[PDB]
Structure 1
Amino acid sequence: MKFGVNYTPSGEWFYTWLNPKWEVIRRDLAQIAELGADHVRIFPLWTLLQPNRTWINPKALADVRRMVELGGEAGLDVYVDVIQGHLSSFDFVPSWLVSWHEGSMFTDQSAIEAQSALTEAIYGTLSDMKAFAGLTLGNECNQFTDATHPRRMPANAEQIGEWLDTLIGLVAKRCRRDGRLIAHSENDAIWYADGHAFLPRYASCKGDVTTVHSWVFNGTGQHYGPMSCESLGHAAWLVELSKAFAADPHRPVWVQAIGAPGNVIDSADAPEFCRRSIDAIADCPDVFGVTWWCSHRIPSAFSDFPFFEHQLGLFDVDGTLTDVGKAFRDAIATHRDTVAPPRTTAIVIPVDEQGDPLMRAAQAPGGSLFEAWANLNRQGERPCVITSLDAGNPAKLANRGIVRLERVELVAGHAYNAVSDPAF
């Protein structure tokens, strides 16, 4: 299992992409490596990368390479997210896709070519880099197609599947030959939102690894309590849930983002949330890695962020180590060698003829399946999660080593909140 942090540049956040202070970035990545992390995740801005649909900015590509270079010289593997897209409640969409040029990145064919050219351009610029570990198509891109988005980019579930297949397929074989990974990222709506065009099986079958972003402001922390077994184990629950919709029985699961948000978790307890959540993740088999959010706190001078976003960094505004920064550093040591035994008792999830849930609000906070797992795990049963389709096929049940099943009737939860802050 791997340990890393999502890199928020100190001093100027992602606005530093306009004019990177490379000596500060070098000091930033050196601090992350000093925690014991082995990798880092970085976020270029789509508006700077591709200011026109048919012109990618060479300076922005070169600046991404420099950060990849500096990350490696600190001893860190660097994972790059291509399309931002969305970052901490803000949207950075190039001018050729807004207002007079409004379009859907998921259905507009010429916009798919632009995303296609940018993905190849990012990989081509970094192909020679030894620390270039892999690509994610973009941070939580599905938020653009959800109905909660104030400028939704429309798309049905089939178009979303073709969207993933097009971009992932461009660089999938280069990634395999080169020894790198290609993956995609979605917020918890893919697991929790009924009617969502991103289906759970997309995250667990498309791409090389399943990415998961565990945030307990989604309803789990207010419904059950900031440090309930439901909340502290939410990251583990997302790990075990995602496996049910995967075809590969030992597919790695990467918790690509997880933090202790101040809006539901208190600062005095935030270190305990870090340690125990990682204890929960460390008990699940086949975890690719744990990437914390985030590296360095957002400067106090920047505005319109949700308040809790300013304290998410592992290093404070003056560069000193945070209380959670000591918890994440100590957790890296505690779990660098811990291996997780196979999980024997599975929770059955009733699913479509094609692998999709009947009622996703039952896997959502407050739902029966959600609570059945938390209750089973709380009692030390280390449960996994299976679908109804796999439950009637002894081959897959054998490959995964399940010997005990659990049927639970579906009751919808109502605690899920699709937005970080009430203002949205």
Structure 2
Amino acid sequence: HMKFGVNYTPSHGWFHAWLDPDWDGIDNDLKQISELGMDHVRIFPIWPYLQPNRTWINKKGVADVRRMVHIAGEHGLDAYVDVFQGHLSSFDFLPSWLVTWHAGNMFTDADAVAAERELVKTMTDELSKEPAFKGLTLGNEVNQLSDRPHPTKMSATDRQIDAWLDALLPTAAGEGHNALYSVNDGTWFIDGHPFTPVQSATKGDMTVIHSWVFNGIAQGYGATSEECSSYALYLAELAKAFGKDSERPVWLQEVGAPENVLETDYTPEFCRKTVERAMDCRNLWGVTWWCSHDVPASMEDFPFFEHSLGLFDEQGQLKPIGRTFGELAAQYRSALPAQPKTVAVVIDVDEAGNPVNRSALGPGGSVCDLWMKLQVAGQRPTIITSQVAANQEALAQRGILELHADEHPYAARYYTAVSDPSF
């Protein structure tokens, strides 16, 4: 069982729909998604609408989110909910009790962390009453608020982020759903970044990744290149290598076909090739495409390509990429899991299990180049850490037979941690 779903962008209003929900349109949105053969949706409430003061939660807003989940279920979809937005498509929505005169750190100020826990437990309790509610992700790429190049960064060490995760994630746990968090790919490509690969592959229930080829992959290897279409698979192999549990699932929680680096006509093939190659990771649990519906052209200041990331267009009509993704779901949702891999790329790690050189793993880095060279060569390479490579019974338990080390490392030549040159 391989899951196929979409990140749900309301067709009428986007995430501004929460201010005045058109429930007939939301219902129609999810009926279309379900008829495409999807089995789940990811849902994005707005934090400052849920919690506009630190000690006052908007109860109509919480019931709004529950209703969206319920309508989803009515159409046979599972629903996954992100809480701390927070960051969406280059916009930050932040509570006024955390900015300007009330500027604070959502990761390190105990007051904030206490209000965050209260909102998550409120969300979790009320949503668990819905059967369609299948998981809680703490927020969307919450790590982007924690380091450069964020212009109003809320700094923290990796040990403080450790405690932040340990404080929030139990509050989201519960019978019948997953507890998760999500990060952008700075977690693996940026040295000194306080969100770390070990956290991503040990805390919460699955290893969660977002695959975006506008981060240098497409510009550096080539939009139509095989490296470019192999990249979601590389991110999945990379992210799972840093867990103690070799079988921990990976959620390809975001993948899209960004038209600032791909040409429009190529996005259906990019979709088919990217998803086909991604399923060659036996740890892959699900694929969630970004996104269900185009962003209304009447809303400005988005980087232009965000308006056309939908599987459905501005009129709500199914696009070629949507037909492709729906055909993928019908072809692979019952496929057997990929065969194990016997060739491995070895990444050196500190005592804690985190990469000694994170810059080498990004687009155009020595590790990424090495994995791609083997992948294009047909070797089906997997990825392990130096702690595993040193242990012969650990190697034999995984069936590894051929090791490739990064002998002459260099930093990622292609990487850029920002979605549009304007930031």
TM-score range, shorter chain: over 0.9
d(CA) in 1 for partners of 2:277 and 2:165? Answer: 30
Which residue of structure 2 lines up, in the alignment, with residue 126 of structure 1? 127
d(CA) in 2 for partners of 1:298 and 1:9? Answer: 8
Structure 2 matches for 1:22-61, cutoff 5 A? 22-61=23-62
d(CA) in 1 for partners of 2:398 and 2:308? Answer: 40
Which residue of structure 2 lines up, in the alignment, with residue 414 of structure 1? 413
Which residue of structure 2 lines up, in the alignment, with residue 166 of structure 1? 167
Question: Structure 1: 5+ residue runs without aligned partners?
Answer: none
User: How far 1:314 sits from its partner (Å)?
Assistant: 0.5
d(CA) in 1 for partners of 2:391 and 2:74? Answer: 49
d(CA) in 2 for partners of 1:423 and 1:347? Answer: 35
Confirm whether residue 423 of structure 1 aligns to residue 394 of structure 2.
no
Number of aligned pairs? 420
Please tell me the residue identity of whatever aligns with 2:19.
Answer: L
4+ long deviations beyond 6 Å: none
Which residue of structure 2 lines up, in the alignment, with residue 104 of structure 1? 105
User: How far 1:171 sits from its partner (Å)?
Assistant: 3.2
d(CA) in 1 for partners of 2:233 and 2:95? Answer: 36
Which residue of structure 1 lines up, in the alignment, with residue 369 of structure 2? 371
Match among 194, 205, 210 for residue 208 of structure 1: 205
Match among 243, 246, 256 for residue 243 of structure 2: 246
TM-score by length of 2: 0.98
Match among 354, 357, 360 for residue 355 of structure 2: 357
Contact 1:249 1:396 in 2 (8 A): no
Which residue of structure 2 lines up, in the alignment, with residue 90 of structure 1? 91
User: How far 1:361 sits from its partner (Å)?
Assistant: 1.1
Confirm whether residue 198 of structure 1 aligns to residue 199 of structure 2.
no
Confirm whether residue 151 of structure 1 aligns to residue 152 of structure 2.
yes
Contact 2:128 2:176 in 1 (8 A): no
Contact 1:26 1:70 in 2 (8 A): yes
d(CA) in 1 for partners of 2:329 and 2:240? Answer: 24
Contact 1:230 1:371 in 2 (8 A): no
d(CA) in 2 for partners of 1:88 and 1:364? Answer: 21
User: How far 1:398 sits from its partner (Å)?
Assistant: 3.1
Q: Secondary structure at the match of 1:269?
A: helix
The RMSD of aligned alpha carbons is: 0.9
Confirm whether residue 383 of structure 1 aligns to residue 369 of structure 2.
no
d(CA) in 2 for partners of 1:153 and 1:40? Answer: 30
User: How far 1:323 sits from its partner (Å)?
Assistant: 1.4
d(CA) in 2 for partners of 1:48 and 1:152? Answer: 22
User: How far 1:394 sits from its partner (Å)?
Assistant: 2.7
Q: 1:218 to 1:74 in 2, by over 3 A?
A: same
User: How far 1:375 sits from its partner (Å)?
Assistant: 1.2
Deviations 1:91-143 (A, max 9, x none): 00011000000011010100001111111011011111100000100000000
Which residue of structure 1 lines up, in the alignment, with residue 324 of structure 2? 327
Please tell me the residue identity of whatever aligns with 2:159.
Answer: E
User: How far 1:82 sits from its partner (Å)?
Assistant: 1.1
Contact 1:249 1:399 in 2 (8 A): no
Q: 1:168 to 1:399 in 2, by over 3 A?
A: farther
Q: Secondary structure at the match of 1:254?
A: strand
Contact 1:361 1:414 in 2 (8 A): no
Contact 1:86 1:140 in 2 (8 A): yes
User: How far 1:405 sits from its partner (Å)?
Assistant: 1.2
Contact 2:256 2:290 in 1 (8 A): yes
d(CA) in 2 for partners of 1:381 and 1:245? Answer: 21
Confirm whether residue 232 of structure 1 aligns to residue 233 of structure 2.
no
Confirm whether residue 300 of structure 1 aligns to residue 297 of structure 2.
yes
User: How far 1:334 sits from its partner (Å)?
Assistant: 2.1
Contact 2:223 2:262 in 1 (8 A): yes
TM-score by length of 1: 0.98
